[PDB]
Short mmCIF file of C-alpha atoms in Angstrom, two decimals:
data_model
loop_
_atom_site.label_atom_id
_atom_site.label_comp_id
_atom_site.label_asym_id
_atom_site.label_seq_id
_atom_site.Cartn_x
_atom_site.Cartn_y
_atom_site.Cartn_z
CA UNK A 1 185.20 106.65 -33.48
CA UNK A 2 185.63 109.94 -31.83
CA UNK A 3 183.44 113.01 -31.81
CA UNK A 4 184.14 116.52 -30.81
CA UNK A 5 185.45 120.09 -32.16
CA UNK A 6 188.81 121.35 -33.29
CA UNK A 7 189.28 125.04 -32.36
CA UNK A 8 185.85 125.67 -33.82
CA UNK A 9 183.73 128.79 -33.20
CA UNK A 10 180.57 128.70 -31.02
CA UNK A 11 176.91 128.71 -32.28
CA UNK A 12 173.60 130.05 -31.06
CA UNK A 13 172.80 126.74 -29.27
CA UNK A 14 176.32 126.70 -27.58
CA UNK A 15 175.57 130.15 -26.07
CA UNK A 16 172.10 129.50 -25.13
CA UNK A 17 172.55 125.96 -24.06
CA UNK A 18 175.43 126.91 -21.76
CA UNK A 19 173.28 129.85 -20.60
CA UNK A 20 170.09 127.84 -20.08
CA UNK A 21 171.65 124.47 -18.95
CA UNK A 22 171.77 125.70 -15.42
CA UNK A 23 167.90 126.41 -15.84
CA UNK A 24 167.28 123.10 -17.33
CA UNK A 25 168.90 121.30 -14.30
CA UNK A 26 167.16 123.52 -11.49
CA UNK A 27 163.91 122.03 -12.85
CA UNK A 28 165.30 118.47 -13.69
CA UNK A 29 168.31 117.43 -11.62
CA UNK A 30 168.08 113.97 -13.04
CA UNK A 31 170.30 115.17 -15.80
CA UNK A 32 173.72 114.13 -15.01
CA UNK A 33 175.24 114.17 -18.58
CA UNK A 34 175.52 116.74 -21.18
CA UNK A 35 173.94 114.28 -23.47
CA UNK A 36 170.78 114.38 -21.66
CA UNK A 37 171.01 118.24 -21.33
CA UNK A 38 171.52 118.73 -24.96
CA UNK A 39 168.44 116.72 -26.05
CA UNK A 40 166.47 118.92 -23.82
CA UNK A 41 168.14 122.21 -24.89
CA UNK A 42 167.29 121.64 -28.42
CA UNK A 43 163.67 121.42 -27.58
CA UNK A 44 163.57 124.77 -26.06
CA UNK A 45 166.14 126.27 -28.34
CA UNK A 46 164.06 125.12 -31.43
CA UNK A 47 160.98 126.99 -29.95
CA UNK A 48 162.86 130.05 -29.08
CA UNK A 49 161.46 133.41 -30.00
CA UNK A 50 162.12 134.45 -33.67
CA UNK A 51 164.33 137.05 -32.09
CA UNK A 52 166.02 134.84 -29.46
CA UNK A 53 167.09 132.57 -32.18
CA UNK A 54 168.63 135.05 -34.61
CA UNK A 55 170.09 136.87 -31.38
CA UNK A 56 171.83 134.01 -29.80
CA UNK A 57 173.20 133.14 -33.13
CA UNK A 58 174.65 136.57 -33.46
CA UNK A 59 176.03 136.47 -30.06
CA UNK A 60 178.21 133.31 -30.36
CA UNK A 61 179.57 135.00 -33.43
CA UNK A 62 181.71 137.45 -31.75
CA UNK A 63 180.80 140.81 -33.15
CA UNK A 64 177.89 143.11 -32.20
CA UNK A 65 178.33 141.98 -28.61
CA UNK A 66 178.90 143.58 -25.26
CA UNK A 67 182.74 142.94 -25.50
CA UNK A 68 184.59 143.68 -28.78
CA UNK A 69 188.12 143.08 -30.07
CA UNK A 70 190.96 145.65 -30.72
CA UNK A 71 193.63 145.04 -33.29
CA UNK A 72 196.70 147.27 -33.63
CA UNK A 73 197.95 148.33 -37.08
CA UNK A 74 195.09 146.25 -38.63
CA UNK A 75 197.16 143.11 -37.59
CA UNK A 76 195.83 139.49 -37.47
CA UNK A 77 194.90 137.78 -34.28
CA UNK A 78 192.60 135.23 -32.52
CA UNK A 79 189.69 137.21 -34.18
CA UNK A 80 189.07 137.28 -37.81
CA UNK A 81 190.16 140.79 -39.03
#
């Protein structure tokens, strides 16, 4: 029994959770394991603003973000082209 991810992309929760995790601890230092941090991140991520949700979900995607990707000669790479 092993759980994890194989070269899989990121989701809105992965971006926010990793961007809020630090904020979750600052308030509750008791959290010493990600398992406890996730259970909480979902509580705040599920109540996020109708915009924050769709947004964070679009950020993890990769496109329409601050940093973009460039492919010479419409070639293939680490980014779905």
